[PDB]
Amino acid sequence: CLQNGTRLLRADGSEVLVEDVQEGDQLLGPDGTSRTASKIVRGEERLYRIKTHEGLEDLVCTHNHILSMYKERESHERVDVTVDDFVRLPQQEQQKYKLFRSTDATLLHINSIELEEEPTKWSGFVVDKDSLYLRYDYLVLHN
């Protein structure tokens, strides 16, 4: 699940804040097709902040949120990993994993991932099909 205020893409290309996503809403998938959201849930807790080397907005999300990544050795394979499991990996293993944006340097290198010191509100939902959808800057996100 994602920090409130995270900007996502509707299926029509306009932006919607994650907490404004409602049941049945259509989001944009990484291949360009529609995704249906359901099971809207909300809570409040200390989230993890992920910062990239590249100048993109931080991703802030719950400890059980699933990151969709590319892992080295094309050149990279698709892997899903929870924030908890990724956080606990040794940094030499972590550097093999990259976030990514949907094509049309699309890999993003994580510079830091840290637990925040105060709780903040988050919103989550499930997405059909491959469970992938787009942030406003085309970062690929998972359920």
Numbering used by the authors: 1 to 73, 90 to 120, 133 to 171
From the study:
At the heart of the spliceosome is pre-mRNA processing factor 8 (Prp8), a large (approximately 270 kDa) and highly conserved protein. Prp8 helps generate mature mRNA by coordinating critical rearrangements at the catalytic core of the spliceosome. The intein-containing precursor undergoes protein splicing, a process that excises the intein and ligates the flanking sequences, called exteins, to form the functional protein. The intein is also found at a highly conserved site at the center of Prp8 and thus is at the core of the spliceosome.
The Cne Prp8 intein was solved to 1.75 Å resolution. The Cne Prp8 intein structure represents only the second known fungal nuclear intein structure. As with all solved intein structures so far, the Cne Prp8 intein has the canonical horseshoe shape, created by pseudo–2-fold symmetry that positions the catalytic N- and C termini in close proximity. Highlighting the splicing blocks (A, B, F, and G), we see the active core that carries out autocatalytic protein splicing. This catalytic center contains the residues essential for splicing: the nucleophilic cysteine (C1) in Block A, and the terminal asparagine (N171) in Block G. The C1 and N171 are also positioned in the vicinity of the conserved Block B TxxH residues (T62 and H65), which are important for priming the intein for self-excision at its amino terminus. For example, Blocks A and B are far apart in sequence but fold proximally in 3D space to execute protein splicing. This representation also illustrates that the unresolved regions of the intein are between Block B and Block F and likely represent flexible linker sequences of a former endonuclease domain. The unstructured regions in the Cne Prp8 intein structure are where the Sce Vma1 intein encodes a linker domain (dashed red lines). A closer look at the active centers of the Cne Prp8 intein and the Sce Vma1 intein demonstrates unmistakable overlap of the catalytic residues, further confirming the similarities. The Cne Prp8 intein only has 2 cysteines: C1 in Block A, and C61 in Block B, immediately preceding the TxxH motif (blue arrowheads).
